[PDB]
């Protein structure tokens, strides 16, 4: 622990210092379980990306995100935005989780391609209101197939 | 270690799909070197190759069946979930089994029944409370118990029977599934005769992609390929009524004269003839007939002859070629528009791409941020895997619309720019 | 190079008419129709290598006694009795005769086989004569297009 | 010719009412505006 994080009472040695568990002059493994954090820290980002997002234009919260950008950094890839129209007649974005054992399976295999005929379908035969339920309908079939692809 | 075996094979079902090509590839090359005095084997000395057509004939069955197997495990709870889906969709908001009853017509529907009344129903869809959304939405105008009547190392000792029945009744009318019983027809066979491997060159339409786009040129238009051949079919018939009243004589495909006579006297023979020599000549059927060198009829035989070339020949085969390339022209054409619809609209809400490129970069953030697919895909999966006591108040609002299929929830013509225009909002 | 070996041999100049490809311009345009689909082309060539393959499968088990291609009878037999003959007889003279591969083939008057024989003809015609063709024509159009 | 013509027809019946010639962006502001125009409002069948 030299060259990702620096090197404080507070920054490598403070984990030193957390990690005095043994007595062989060793260490274990169970550090990273123990350290959890993350299920915080997710919350903590969609709590300020709906500020920011939200509210605008004040450099007091950018004073504050500049100080966050190492977490917002880890939580992009696991951090979905939606908008739905809301019960009050108003839209609303959505924040949530998103894993990786799906954006893992979303990516490269066939189902780009299954994407690619789906679209080909609907913008060619087309409809009314028979084109949600077909992506909806997409959307389910895929995450059957995500799911026993998971399987293995 | 069978459930890992399972999960091998239909992690590897396309590899050995491929393999069983390039396998029968070999044999289709072996078999090259076939001779007679029966039918012998003769190499250019090297007797390598008997013994390696005895191995390969038997490679072929047994990935064929580990193919089988693969589709089995893979791609049938698929077709399997779809159909229990629909099912299920049908009795909640359309009521079929309860009211309409369907027709003898929709085989589907009828066969469909005998899944209701089991216990292992909802294996698949990720639905159980079915049931239970019927026995409240006519538990009273229709019955209660007519309703529960209608619907409700030691590991091969326990499992049923009725589900099991309607099972494979789907995929017996699976159409990969009876391609693949095919294929493993025809390597059995193969050993009976070892010719009957050629028969699996036919995959390469299903193996490669680019060759499938090849033959949608033909299949785009098939039906009016076949009817093109009947119209000609019906043109032929016509022309040799006319000859077999009137021109009869002409039809001498004998040797030199004073020979006995092969001669088209009936009909079914000119017909024959016809549709073998007529069209099948690049030239019509003047060239294949005798010449009428000052005869009453010349002028007719002339117009039947220029006819028959001008109405055959060149018209009904250039509709064939005509309805190949007005296919690729078709196909093209569609592509084309997917990209213009996809690049002026959002799919979801169908604004356009003036609104969001009065910023910079903003169709190009509406369609990657924003309105995404895949972050709508994905909140479904939340939702699924979550439970119906930790949501919030946005997603029990979403929830009571996905399972009720309102899909009022999704924007349409209003975004969250339109609406909070930053102008005091 | 070739205008080394020019020297050699006085023809091999003959190779630098098809620089007329790269310095011509609306040559370029032309042959670029055919460029846009060589791969296209390519699998259709298969394709058809693969279905003449098919008919001479039949033609070996069923159709042999019909392809003596020698003089007036009570004379040699030059036949194709061998798969690799077959193959190439139909390949060189199947495609390349505008009619299939019945116009060099003794004629069916009165056989068991005969209207098994007349499916395998018109299918031929139908089927490498005809479509396969108009997919190469095609595909030529429709990169003009 | 004959293709390119029915694709037309097409276009002219998704992109505008038969009988005003609006468009299909004043309505579908509102969510479904184009298809109750053509479904309720301007019928052909209801103008018959
Ligand atoms: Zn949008
Ligand atoms: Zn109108």
Same mark, same amino acid.
């Given at each position: ?152 | 270690?069978?459930?890992? !075996? ?19 590839? +070999?044999?289709?090359?072996? &078999? &090259? ?19 390696? &057509? ?41 009521? !079929? ?20 009344? %089991? ?36 590991? !091969? ?21 009876? @391609? ?8 059995? &066979? ?20 680019? *060759? ?27 022309? %040799?009524?006319? +000859? ?26 000119? @017909? ?34 220029? %006819? ?8 009904? *085969? ?54 995404? *697919? ?37 924007? +349409? ?13």
């Amino acid at each position: 622990m030299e060259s990702h994080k620096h090197y404080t009472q507070s920054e490598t040695e403070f984990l030193l210092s957390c990690a005095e568990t043994d007595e062989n002059e060793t260490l274990d493994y169970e550090e990273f379980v123990k350290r959890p954090a993350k299920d915080i820290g997710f919350n903590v980002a969609v709590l300020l990306t709906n500020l920011s997002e939200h509210m605008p234009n004040d450099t007091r919260l950018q004073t504050f995100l500049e100080l966050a950008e190492s977490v917002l950094n880890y939580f992009q890839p696991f951090l979905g935005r939606i908008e739905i129209m809301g019960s009050a007649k108003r839209i609303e974005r959505v924040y949530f989780e998103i894993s990786e054992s799906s954006r893992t399976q979303w990516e490269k295999p066939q189902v780009k391609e299954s994407k690619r005929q789906f679209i080909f379908d609907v913008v060619n035969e087309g409809g009314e209101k028979e084109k949600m339920e077909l992506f909806v309908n997409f959307c389910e079939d895929t995450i059957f197939e995500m799911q026993l692809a998971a399987q293995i | 270690y069978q459930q890992k !075996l399972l999960n091998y094979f239909a992690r590897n079902f396309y590899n050995m799909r491929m393999l069983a090509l390039f396998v029968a590839f +070999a044999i289709n090359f072996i &078999l &090259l070197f076939y001779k007679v005095s029966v039918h012998y084997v003769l190499e250019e000395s090297s007797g390598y190759m008997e013994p390696t &057509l005895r191995i390969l004939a038997i490679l072929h069955t047994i990935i064929s069946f580990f193919c089988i197997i693969g589709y089995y495990c893979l791609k049938v709870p698929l077709v399997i979930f779809k159909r229990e889906k629909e099912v299920a969709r049908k009795l909640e908001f359309d009521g !079929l089994y309860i009211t309409e009853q369907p027709s003898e017509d929709d085989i589907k529907g009828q066969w469909d029944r005998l899944v209701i009344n %089991t216990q292992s129903f909802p294996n698949n869809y990720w639905d159980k409370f079915v049931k239970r959304k019927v026995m409240d939405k006519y538990g009273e105008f229709y019955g209660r118990d007519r309703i529960s009547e209608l619907l409700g190392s030691a590991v !091969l000792n326990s499992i049923d029977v009725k589900y099991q029945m309607w099972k494979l009744g789907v995929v017996f009318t699976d159409n990969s599934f009876l @391609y693949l019983a095919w294929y493993m027809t025809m390597s059995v &066979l193969g050993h009976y005769n070892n010719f009957f491997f050629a028969a699996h060159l036919l995959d390469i339409a299903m193996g490669f992609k680019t *060759l499938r786009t090849i033959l949608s040129s033909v299949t785009h238009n098939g039906k009016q390929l076949v009817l093109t051949v009947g119209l000609l079919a019906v043109v032929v018939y016509l022309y %040799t009524v006319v +000859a077999f009243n009137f021109f009869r004589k002409f039809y001498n495909k004998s040797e030199d004269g004073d020979t006995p006579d092969m001669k088209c006297d009936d009909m079914l023979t000119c @017909y024959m003839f016809h549709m073998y020599v007529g069209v099948r000549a690049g030239g019509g059927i003047g060239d294949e007939i005798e010449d009428p060198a000052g005869d009453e009829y010349e002028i007719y035989r002339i117009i039947f002859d220029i %006819t028959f070339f001008f109405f055959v020949i060149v018209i009904l *085969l250039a509709i064939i070629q005509g309805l190949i390339i007005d296919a690729f022209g078709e196909l093209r054409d569609q592509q084309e528009q997917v990209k213009e619809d996809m690049e002026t609209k959002c799919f979801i809400c169908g604004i356009g791409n003036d609104y969001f490129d009065t910023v910079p970069h903003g169709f190009e953030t509406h369609t990657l941020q924003e309105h995404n *697919l895949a972050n709508y895909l994905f909140f479904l999966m939340y939702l699924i895997n979550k439970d119906e006591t930790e949501h919030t108040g946005q997603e029990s609002y979403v929830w009571k619309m996905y399972q009720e299929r309102c899909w009022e929830f999704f924007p +349409a013509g209003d975004c969250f720019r339109k609406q909070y225009e930053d102008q005091l909002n």
